Structure formats: C-alpha cells, structure tokens
C-alpha cells in the first residue's frame, strides 16, 4: 500500500473506481484536477491504464531547510 497522486479532470473522475483496485481516496483537491489515493503497489499500473487518468505520481518527500 502506497500513497500516489492521480491527475484527472474533475468532471471525469469517479471516486468509486479506486475501491475496485484495492485503494481508497485520501484527499480530493479543490483547486487542481488531482486526487491523493492509497493503493496496493500493483494498482499503480492499473491507474495509469485508465483513459481519464493523465498522470500518476509517487508521493515525494521534502525536508526542512
């Protein structure tokens, strides 16, 4: 189970399609067309395959400076 960020148009994303691949929604952005989700590692390729999905990005790390 990994956290990824999926870029997908507001009007063509259904929150319910991520349960099917073993995931769940963490946060739906109000201001950009993206959603944070937790999915099994094997689900990443599945997300990419979806036509409505523009990009799947891993959750990277920043540190204090």
């Amino acid at each position: 189970t990994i956290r990824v960020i999926v870029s997908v148009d507001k009007a063509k994303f259904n929150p319910h399609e991520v349960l099917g691949i073993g995931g769940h929604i963490v946060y739906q952005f109000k201001l950009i067309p993206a959603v944070v989700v937790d999915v099994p590692a094997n689900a990443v390729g599945k997300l990419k395959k979806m036509p409505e999905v523009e990009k799947v990005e891993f959750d990277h790390q920043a540190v204090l400076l």
Binding site: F29, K30, L31, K55, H60, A62, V63, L64, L65
Partner: protein, 318 residues
C-alpha cells in the same frame, strides 16, 4: 522572558525604518507559513497567529493540538517574519502581520509533497474554505476573501511533480507571492519548489555578507541565514542557520511591500517574474532594491542581492 533585541538579520534587510509606515498590520494581508507548525501561545507570536491548520497525512485539521509545532523550525521561521515589536524576545521583519501557520512537515521536519500541496491549497482557500467568494477573480488582496498574500516555504525536495507545480500555478494566479528556500546542499541550482519560475528562490548570507557555503546556487535573492536568533518552543528562543532562515526575511519584506501598497492604494502589486526589473511588480521591486553583492548584477551566489525592506517599500509607494 528576555528583554527584546533586534536580531542582526532584521537590521540587515532594513526592516526597522519601515515600521513607521507599516508593521504589516493591514487587515487584508496574511502570510501563510508552510512548515512544522507553530508554538501558537508563544508570548512573542500569539497575537499575530490568525489561523493554525495542519495538512499532515492528507487530512486538514484546524485543531490546535494538530497545528502545534512539535519540531521548532516553524516557530523559528514565523518569528523572523512576525515576532511582535514589544518589550520581550525578538521582533520580525513585519511585526504586526497576520500569520496563517499551515503545518505540512511533521515532528522530525519531513513532509510529503501531497501534504505540502494540500497546504498551498489551504493558503489560497483560507479559513472560509473558498478561494474566491465573490467570483471576481481577485483572490490575494480582495478584502472580501481571506486568502494569504504570501506563501512562505522554508523547505525543499529534489522532485518536480506536475500536480505540485499545478498548485504553485494556482497560487500564482490568485496573486499570491510565493517564496521558498533555495536549499542547503551547496548545489548548482535551487530545490523545488524554489526552482519554479513562479517562486522566489532564496539563498542565505552570513553576518559578514558572505554567501553561506551550504546555500544552493542561482537563487533569485538572498537574505540573512546564519546565526539567526528567533522564537522557538516552548515560549523560548534559539539560533539557527539555513536557507529556511533566509526565506522568512524575504516573505517579511513582501508582506511590508503589499501592506504598504494596500494601505496607500487599496490594491496589491502583481507578483511579477524572475526577469522583472521594474518598480511595477513585487519581484521587480525586490530585484532593483536588493543590495547587489558579489560581481555586479545578478550572480549565482546572491541572485539579485540582499533584500532591503526600506528601499523596497519606497519603490512601491513612489
């Protein structure tokens, strides 16, 4: 509580002479500091803490318990912007400015890009959860909305993610000046998000006006970032170094510029671009009034130079 001093960095960026014009306490102006949280009851900070949120683990919480600083770094950065001008402690660049503390880094000073992007969103939306309540496209500087006018990020990572950039772009288009630390790896260029065109990358100088060896190169401007005394938990003070300490000096200067400009004109200045050398945008003003150290002109150590609030504000009002 110790008697107030003015840390050397506050003096260096020429903040104290501005205060007769504004201390940043113009009601439409807020600075959002995306960091480890804040010691919200600190005697030298509390009155300027206007909103305390956390986005940790992808859930927005406004509980004080969740927004509290468990590290110290956020409290320190906030103090450099907005420590109160009174009888105790230290004093910020903009000592009357309202602060939104947005907690995006955890107790150990680490953060996910997702939590940071959610933090940026919160700074645009504000307490009311709505970017642009009256639908006029004016967000920063609209007295009807509660969006921050400055987003300050004393943090960085190596990754350039499209969604995080999209969020940066939303903040920019809301009229918000975005300021971020260049990084502490002595690298040839800034970390993200400092490296984005819409964001002011900030390098660190020491008290001799030398660039700090750790400061990532090719910043836009530079500011005090070594031996920086500020607020620190719990209700105390600490001295730190880093591009994270330089950043809030610049955010503070921006807050003074925008406060002074709104006080005079009832509007704010456009953000501007990296190339801007006019007096017509925030960044243009920062570039032209910066103290040009090192080689003549923008250089890879200092960028355009060391920010100076007094001249910045005069350029804004003139």
């Amino acid at each position: 509580q110790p008697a107030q001093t003015i840390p050397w960095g506050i003096e260096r960026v020429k903040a104290p002479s501005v205060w007769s014009i504004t201390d940043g306490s113009v009601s439409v102006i807020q600075v959002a500091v995306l960091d480890t949280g804040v010691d919200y009851d600190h005697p030298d900070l509390a009155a300027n803490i206007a909103w305390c949120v956390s986005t940790l683990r992808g859930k927005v919480s406004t509980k004080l318990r969740d927004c509290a600083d468990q590290n110290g770094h956020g409290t320190h950065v906030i103090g450099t912007i907005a420590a109160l001008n009174n009888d105790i402690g230290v004093v910020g660049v903009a000592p009357g400015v309202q602060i939104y503390s947005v907690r995006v880094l955890d107790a150990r000073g680490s953060g996910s890009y997702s939590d940071i992007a959610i933090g940026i969103e919160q700074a645009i939306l504000g307490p009311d959860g709505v970017a642009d309540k009256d639908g006029d496209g004016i967000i920063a500087g609209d007295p009807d909305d509660d969006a921050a006018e400055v987003i300050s990020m004393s943090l960085g990572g190596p990754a350039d993610d499209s969604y995080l950039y999209d969020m940066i772009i939303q903040a920019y288009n809301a009229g918000i000046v975005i300021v971020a630390a260049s990084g502490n790896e002595g690298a040839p260029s800034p970390s993200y998000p400092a490296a984005y065109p819409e964001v002011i990358a900030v390098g660190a100088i020491d008290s001799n006006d030398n660039i700090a060896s750790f400061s990532n190169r090719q910043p836009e401007v530079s500011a005090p970032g070594v031996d920086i005394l500020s607020t620190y938990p719990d209700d105390s003070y600490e001295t730190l170094m880093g591009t994270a300490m330089a950043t809030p000096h610049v955010s503070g200067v921006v807050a003074l510029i925008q406060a002074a400009y709104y006080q005079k004109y009832g509007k704010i200045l456009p953000v501007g671009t990296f190339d801007d050398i006019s007096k017509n945008t925030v960044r243009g003003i920062l570039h032209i009034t910066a103290d040009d150290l090192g080689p003549t002109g923008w250089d890879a150590d200092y960028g355009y130079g060391v920010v100076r609030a007094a001249l910045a504000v005069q350029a804004a009002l003139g």
